[PDB]
Write a protein that binds this ligand. Structure first.
Ligand SMILES: [Fe+3]
Ligand SMILES: [Fe+3]
Ligand SMILES: [Fe+3]
Ligand SMILES: [Fe+3]
Lengths: 200, 238, 238, 200, 238, 200, 200
């Protein structure tokens, strides 16, 4: 058969990932421009939301060295790839769990609806890639919203998860943090309540 | 905004390391036990950030000057350079390449590293750059030393540099580690050996590149990176 | 009624596929984690149904005629024939052989298959017969097409026909899959690769059999089946 | 050593097993004669019983595409191997799980006692072989009866299972379906309460 | 109008099949017995039609849709794609590629084919396209079945698709046949064996191309075509 | 020596060539635009002529499944390569033998004189490539005209044929079909009167 | 693919074939029972006929060392395989051309009509196998009869010969020899009028 050049193989991001990719989180000096956890400035259109979560291993213990990358549509359902710290909104961001701060946070807007390749609407979601010591190739997941039950039930991606009880692992829980709208999205890498991870 | 106009060759997850590789002890509790759920590519997966207008500092790619506290870092001066292409051999221009590493003694500048080998006051161990219009990147740095770690009772990482590459989409994004030609620690390392196929391990070994060295100044290593092949959509929804 | 008068050679469960073969994703949650418990052969295990008195329809072995809704099925006309023997080389006569498959386009006539390739109005996909007095069976059918399936993101079964064979006892009964000589999908398939030994995989590949073809009509494939060796009891209870 | 011809290796029966072996369940027309789940005609000797059960995977979810073959002695402890739809009793039968409820049923008689090869009586049992998508080689088990406690405690096959707790997984529970005597035999392929599976 | 500005590398008529290959019976009376007469290249031979201004229908390259009589054709959905280059490796852009084939059962939609395998009411068997600016072509179709034919008493063509390629001149124009990776009929065919060199036969075998497949939709094969090398004239008439 | 990439090897066009290249003749519906046998619109410059012929095998029997491609200069000695059904004249065309009578036809103009690469005029000619079942690589020939005797006698291509008798095989015979000027060009693949075929 | 034991390869019967297979024709002493050229004794039902012929090589010269075997139905269209010199009819015989007698002869009856495997009637025919020095594997042909024109035109075997003019090579010419019905069937191995030979 036709065999292309093989992809460079993945390796773990290791325990010191923050020194390269989360400098402030590493407690190290930062450069003038950093890619971090504020996707939306106050002026961005849409519903401003705080996202937060903890990451657990197969023994139910906190993962205190996680690094997360996120990719989401703006409030109008458009992906914005022109990354610039001057933008009121960026579709991409980074966050981390650390020894001092075991709960990651993101400051963003709720993403608008995006159609899949067949033209079928997907429920509002944030794409997440999870890296850490012990993770040899990053884990892909999606964060959906518990206040989008109708859309979630019809999402062509959620519906590829064979068991309804596993779909529930991808649904973030709405709360309020200091009077502001928030959602908690905890990830369980292994075992009871294991978070659905995707391949694509 | 970004558009869905391309597809990416599916990953070979037996070429990559598997999640559960128990000789690398931390993988035991940090590997999913359920199968990954395959999903078709949509605009969510086939787009990603472009960093053309991220503002880079003058020395962001030069680890000999980017942690300057009154002198040069101690250790083997080297250029690390290479090309990013996709599996079809197409260069990946204007893509973000980030790297980080220990100093010449295998010590990381992170509070969690308490290895007794000293920090170097003029070394930080962090770089970034964009590939140029032909897909080439280059860093200047110190060759990192092997780093002992609490896995088995006498385990030492080969000299290594972590790499992160964005590529055209979140589907192409990769973190990996570069190793150095001839390092006798490579065959012994349980993290290297998370990769089952020996030909895949060879893809992570940077080669001494005398052609690219500055005489009486610095040596050079070459490390090429291959991201998932990108193709146009064809015959979809019809 | 049946009697206990024979013993069957113990299975090699490293020749067969193991239960847990995670690249075949559905095996992860459908594989026992405890060891199988070995038990000695008794009349319960060394006997089984014989189907000599089952009533077969005229076209039960002929998939070109057994789902006739006004014409012939579209696709590659083939005979699939072979012999069922045990491990000692003894023919297994008057034994039930059942088979089922997708149509020429890899679509199954099953309520749960929604692959977009069309059903064939003159193809059902099920056959059965008994081996003759010398152990031989014969079916006529259409060569099935590869079938995509939701395992990895771009997984395709090789062309295959499912087989079930009863044999002399419940200890011999087997379900397996026949593949076709030369199919480039065979080395890629995680279901094929559930079998760890490459020589065992080869035993599932039917060979083109020109000697058995009907010129200007149909080609032929040969697929021989080996059931557990049967021997008389000896030196038991003494 | 002496090496015979290798046995043909097993493969999964796949999710479409019912096309070939359970035609009605596939949604398909049946042939004149089918091997199915009614082992006993109404006037077969013995105690007429319904057997039923559900099959669970390692996550506790129903296996809706199971296929089961059964082999049992008649009420007089005789194995009837001359399969025939006209027989008062067939020792062999087939069943499958409904896709909606995941429940299989079998209509039979309670099997009589048969001796093992050493002449020791085995408790009344039905031999089962389980096939499905995800199962690479079929799983052998036995269904015993909870109202045969005395015989069960002496069965030379049950006593080969080292742990009493695991012996319990093979004991079907007497119940009533539509007012008629039944026994429920659930199978757990993996994990908590995992059913004992045999090699022979 | 066209001009004479190039020369084409002379054909190797021992790499091509010879005219007289008697195992292909029809060649016996349809092969010249006199030697070909060599003539120098002139404008007559070094020019030819270009088809950039031919009007193609929307589905001309798509055999799944171009004979639509109420449904999809039955059989193995495949993309057949590749590149047309010359012997110097130069792509041949904007060139006419035509193809034709039997249906999934080896039956041709031609008044002279009376093979008993049925026609498919939604399959015609003809495609055409132009290569793109980089030399690439693409068709979508059904994998054809082997076709029995009246040569020897039990002769069967391997699965094959006929190709015609125009190229830059009448000197480059070629008709050939594509065969499929692994087909056990290939070594047996007297038409394949009209080519004496086994390495030349291999050049006609399309390879399974999973990278180009549409998951849950269609597989893909890759078939690259090499036309005679084109060079500029040099040192002529002096 | 220098060895380039090998050319893709030829194979016979087969008995069903018309499915792909002569759709009407296969018995099949045509597409909007087809490349066929009418090279000249009625008002193309030059002398409008019919060409026709039959093709014979080595036993003297008609080859009823021939397929022919032709390439010729226009009346002004220009090769028109920008193929277009709207052109007054196309230098390229296709034809095929009728299965009943084995006769092909072409509607064109008499081609003007073109020079060879050394600047020597060639007699008026039409380049032909012949394909069929039984023909493993197509046969190249040229059709010249019997009313161009003076030009023919001086043609540098005809003069490369060593024997005068063989040169005669390339000379089409003027005739009249339906009262209109025509030239008949029969091809004999093998044996008595075998047509000269070229390599270039 | 499946490869059986290869067939033993043929070799020429050589110039001395008659010493083994045509003893009288070799002018050598005969054994008590010989297989020869009288298929029918006078008492056989059907139309008694004399067959005769000469065999020619590619230069048109007589083959004077041929050996022929024939196999035909009786007058009722039945093949009689129980060979016995006591039979009024045998379906099998042998003849030869020699230096003294260059024209072979057979004494037989006209065969009845036999259906092919699809149930379609074949025209009356005698199956012939031809052996000689220079013939590496024997040549199979059929002798049909010129007074069976209607049947011959509809014979599914004759109709597999693509050219009508080659079918004529298999048609024997009725004559009278000493007041008795005869047919001449000459065979031309090679060249002009070459006899059709079959593979099966
Ligand atoms: Fe490290
Ligand atoms: Fe299947
Ligand atoms: Fe063909
Ligand atoms: Fe001799």
């Amino acid at each position: 058969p036709i065999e292309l050049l093989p992809e460079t193989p993945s390796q773990t991001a290791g325990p010191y990932v923050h020194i390269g990719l989360a400098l402030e989180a590493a407690g190290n000096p930062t450069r003038d421009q950093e890619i971090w956890n504020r996707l939306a400035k106050p002026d961005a259109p849409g519903e401003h939301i705080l996202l937060l979560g903890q990451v657990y291993d197969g023994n139910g213990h906190l993962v205190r060295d996680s690094f997360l990358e996120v990719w989401q549509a703006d409030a109008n359902g458009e992906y914005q790839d022109a990354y610039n710290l001057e933008n009121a909104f960026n579709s991409f961001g980074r966050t981390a769990t650390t020894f001092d701060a075991g709960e990651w946070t993101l400051h963003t807007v709720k993403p608008g609806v995006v159609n899949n390749a067949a033209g079928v609407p997907m429920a509002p979601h944030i794409n997440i890639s999870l890296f850490a010591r012990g993770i040899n190739i990053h884990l892909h997941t999606r964060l959906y919203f518990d206040d989008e039950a109708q859309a979630n039930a019809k999402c062509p991606v959620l519906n590829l998860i064979e068991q309804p009880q596993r779909r529930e692992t991808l649904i973030a829980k709405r709360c309020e943090v200091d009077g502001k709208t928030a959602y908690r999205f905890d990830i369980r890498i292994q075992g009871e309540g294991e978070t659905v991870f995707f391949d694509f | 905004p970004a558009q869905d106009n391309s597809r990416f060759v599916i990953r070979d997850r037996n070429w990559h390391p598997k999640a559960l590789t128990p000789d690398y002890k931390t993988s035991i509790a940090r590997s999913p036990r359920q199968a990954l759920v395959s999903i078709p590519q949509s605009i969510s997966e086939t787009t990603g950030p472009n960093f053309s207008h991220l503002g880079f500092g003058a020395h962001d790619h030069d680890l000999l000057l980017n942690f300057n506290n009154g002198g040069l870092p101690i250790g083997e001066r080297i250029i690390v350079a290479g090309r990013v292409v996709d599996q079809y051999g197409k260069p990946v221009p204007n893509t973000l390449v980030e790297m980080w590493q220990a100093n010449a003694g295998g010590r990381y500048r992170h509070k969690n590293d308490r290895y007794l080998a000293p920090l170097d006051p003029n070394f930080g161990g962090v770089g970034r750059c964009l590939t140029d219009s032909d897909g080439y990147y280059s860093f200047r740095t110190i060759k990192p030393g092997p780093a002992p770690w609490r896995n088995g009772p006498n385990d030492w990482r080969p000299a290594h540099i972590y790499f992160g590459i964005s590529g055209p989409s979140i589907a192409t994004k990769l973190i990996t580690q570069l190793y150095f030609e001839g390092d006798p620690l490579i065959p012994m390392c349980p993290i290297v050996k998370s990769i089952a196929n020996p030909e895949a391990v060879q893809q992570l070994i940077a080669k001494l590149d005398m052609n690219n060295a500055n005489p009486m100044d610095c040596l050079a290593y070459r490390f090429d990176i291959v991201l998932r092949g990108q193709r146009k959509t064809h015959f979809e929804n019809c």
